[PDB]
């Protein structure tokens, strides 16, 4: 073609730590993210809306709230995302007695949640293994072949670093985590 060619061609031609404002920004939580991975029995307030907005893009939030029931909305949205992507997530709490009622409530809320302690090994095949940091520090020094599958490490009560006899565990752990683990 000669004339059609012309008749077509004429038409064809550093900071490293971002202090996000607590209260102002979020106005549109449902225009984007219209299919949330978890549905509550109430309305998530502003800061949990921002924390979920940043958990969608695989960032690394540092939530700092008052009440213990306000943090676990994030702490279980991250596990709903972990089960949606087929990946695995490790929830680590410092107190040995605190990581039992969390096991029960996370097994009641959704599916499979394994628990690991000094002797108990309930379901070491689930996707929400619940651990004491002294065990994660012990399976970071060897491979343990679970670290190949992690997405999130939910350090629960990170204000125990100020302790004098167990604060070295959180810093032996926070260094050895491989790069792909948020």
């Amino acid at each position: 073609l000669a004339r059609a060619s012309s008749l077509e061609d004429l038409v064809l031609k550093e900071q490293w730590a971002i202090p996000v404002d607590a209260t102002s920004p979020v106005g549109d939580f449902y225009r984007l993210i219209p299919q949330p991975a978890f549905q509550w029995a109430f309305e998530p307030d502003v800061f949990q809306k921002q924390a979920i907005l940043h958990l969608e893009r695989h960032d690394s939030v540092f939530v700092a709230a008052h009440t213990s029931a306000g943090k676990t909305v994030v702490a279980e949205y991250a596990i709903a995302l972990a089960q949606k992507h087929m990946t695995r997530t490790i929830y680590t709490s410092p107190i040995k007695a605190l990581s039992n009622q969390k096991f029960r409530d996370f097994r009641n809320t959704f599916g499979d949640v394994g628990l690991l302690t000094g002797d108990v090994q309930l379901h070491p095949e689930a996707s929400c293994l619940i651990m004491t940091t002294e065990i994660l520090r012990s399976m970071l020094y060897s491979g343990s072949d679970v670290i190949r599958d992690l997405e999130w490490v939910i350090f629960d009560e990170v204000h125990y670093i100020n302790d004098v006899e167990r604060g070295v565990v959180w810093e032996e752990v926070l260094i050895m985590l491989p790069d792909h683990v948020s």
Binding site: L116, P124, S138, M139, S142, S144, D145, V146, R148
Partner: protein, 50 residues
């Protein structure tokens, strides 16, 4: 390994062609990267020297 082939567009397995592996001579007790063979077998999760 007999790796598959893929049509560059609308990928479908045309045929299987043999190629050379590249990350052998790498073991679980002498290298540290996410390419080493998984491990001996189903094994204790932690408390494993070597």
């Amino acid at each position: 390994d007999l790796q598959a082939q893929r049509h560059p567009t609308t990928g479908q397995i045309l045929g299987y062609k043999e190629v050379l592996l590249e990350n052998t001579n790498l073991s679980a007790t002498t290298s540290l990267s996410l390419r080493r063979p998984p491990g001996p077998a189903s094994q204790s999760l932690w408390g494993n020297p070597t």
